Symmetry: C2
Subunit: 374 residues, 2 copies
């Protein structure tokens, strides 16, 4: 029968069984990790699906501890009277398919008892939607009030809206495009190449060997982190200043260099290289128009009310992409600009501005749910 939600804030492991993927590969025995905040309404009409980005997980909000290395990636967003007001909403977040924080990914054990590793299938954003839909269906949830996400989570949100418009009332699509761009695929494929160059990659079958391509993932993450920054803010913050008392003229580090090294290290302590590869390839696959007559036709026939957010200084998902989403989606009233110096990472750091987009999306979803009968 249907499986119960985990206790508030705790990890629930939802076993959804075999999943047929977009490329025709069957992935057996999938598990999706779930966290939720807020009660499920008796009519199951109050679900807000919170969709994490590349290195995110199900830990949207709350402090570090009890298996979580840091505070939630959107800490503060869900709570009483918060942008996701848990007095009304049931905020659910999964660990994405391919992930390394409780869901089936390359580190997970294949039927042969060895990690998937190099055997892990190519997945798409659509596969990530399909796995989350199945996890919800196993929890007895067939309709969602809203999908919300930034970055890779915006790609997930947008595919969810386009693929299942009859089963979502509204969405927030923040800091993403309709499809991966040449520059996104370029950086993503080159980050992947930096991981695969690392001799400890062992063809993707390093899991359980005691060696891992952390060094190559640290290089990938340093390049990705630059794509996430606002150029002007980064120069205002570090300029060409040396790190502490080091002397770059005789081989010491610059402050921005030391910072990037620290970012690489932080990721290597919490995140799996193989997951980085799989999710980076799923981002390169992003294309809402595939099999749907292209991006313009796919977005123009999607009727879902949508808040489209774009960040002025974003270098990875530049604001022209969100202007295109806002023009093509008929349920978008106009682009909501996030006026920020913090680049793409504004989707995480501009808590007040992002929280206002979320609250607008959910006020809209509540009005539509009052008129939606199921």
């Amino acid at each position: 029968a249907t499986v119960p939600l985990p206790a508030e804030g705790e990890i629930g492991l939802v076993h959804i069984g075999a999943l047929t993927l977009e490329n025709g590969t069957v992935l057996p025995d999938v598990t999706i990790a779930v966290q939720r905040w807020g009660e499920l309404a008796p009519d199951r009409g109050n679900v807000v699906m919170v969709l994490h980005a590349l290195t995110g997980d199900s830990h949207v909000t709350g402090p570090a501890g009890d298996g979580h290395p840091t505070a939630g990636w959107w800490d503060g967003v869900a709570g009483p009277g918060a942008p996701i007001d848990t007095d009304h909403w049931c905020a659910i977040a999964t660990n994405v398919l391919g992930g390394c924080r409780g869901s089936t990914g390359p580190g997970s054990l294949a039927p042969d008892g060895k990690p998937w590793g190099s055997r892990f299938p190519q997945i798409t954003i659509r596969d990530q939607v399909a796995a989350d839909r199945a996890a919800l269906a196993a929890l007895g949830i067939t309709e969602v009030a809203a999908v919300v996400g930034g970055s890779m989570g915006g790609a997930r949100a947008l595919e969810w809206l386009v693929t299942h418009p009859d089963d979502v009332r509204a969405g927030l699509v923040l800091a993403v495009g309709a499809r991966a761009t040449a520059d996104q695929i370029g950086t993503q494929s080159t980050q992947v190449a930096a991981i695969k160059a690392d001799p400890d990659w062992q063809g993707g079958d390093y899991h359980g060997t005691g060696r891992a391509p952390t060094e190559g993932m640290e290089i990938a993450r340093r390049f990705a982190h630059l794509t996430y920054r606002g150029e002007e803010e980064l120069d205002d913050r570090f300029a060409n200043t040396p790190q502490d008392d080091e002397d770059p003229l005789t081989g010491g580090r610059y402050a921005v260099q030391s910072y990037l090294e620290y970012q690489g290290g932080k990721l290597a302590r919490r995140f799996d290289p193989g997951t980085y590869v799989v999710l980076s390839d799923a981002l390169s696959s992003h294309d809402v128009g595939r099999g749907r007559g292209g991006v313009e036709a796919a977005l123009r026939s999607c009727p879902v009310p949508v808040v489209v957010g774009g960040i002025t200084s974003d270098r990875l998902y530049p604001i022209r992409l969100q202007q295109e989403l806002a023009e093509l989606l008929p349920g978008c009233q106009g682009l909501d600009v996030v006026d920020s110096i913090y680049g793409h990472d504004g989707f995480l750091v501009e808590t007040e501005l992002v929280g206002k987009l979320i609250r607008r999306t959910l006020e809209l979803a509540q009005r539509l749910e009052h008129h939606h009968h199921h």
Copy 2:
């Protein structure tokens, strides 16, 4: 007598002896590779110094031939009636100090008979200007009519102008800033880290071992190439299209990915990883304000007539940097805006527009 200029199109190797570098290290027995086009005037007053960028060399112009597997990196810029009209001007280009195409760099032999490798000193843009000036002096040339360069070549030109305003009549500073930015240092230092991560780096001492960190340099060059592109143009050219008949949904390549792999490979066939490291660190060192009371003081101090060019779509040296240079250099009449979709690589691709800015610069030199 002076060291003779090489015959038009041939490489001359100019031995300048020891160089005291900015960090105090003395680099012994330096050789600078030189090429020139056009006659040196009887008064030695008609030299136009052409300053190459990160992966350039002395081969400014001319076809692929013996000793040059590809066309000049600024092919057509110098020649009869060309933007550097060699009927009137003597175009000279070095291989930069730290380079791998004839000049002393990491691959060159140290006094101890082994490649410099990990013993190669950290050099600055100012050290590159000092090496070029010493090579010109050995050839009997103590002043130049103009310095021209884009990118790292722009940093070399700017330091030349600010350091030696009495010894240059005009300059072109194209697609660079007054100092390295946090983003430039971030990508430069991470590109270097990709090379050093490669187990064939061998601490910098791979030269002559039969192994080289080409894989790490190919990674570094793929990321650098993206910094050189205009985002919109790159998406217009490749979008998310697959490479030929490959299927990215089952592990195939995208067209942009295949193109980047190709760019990496091309550099691996012609360029030394150790040179990449040394010159990337020289770029991170770039700061015309150092020891001069900061960038604004240093630029305001320089009275030389200067054409400052910036590319509207440049993602690596964004145009705010060239607006700063244009505002502060008193010899600059305004920012020359190169309205181009081709990003930073515009400094190489926009030959007609770059040629126009070179003609303006040589008008100021007269």
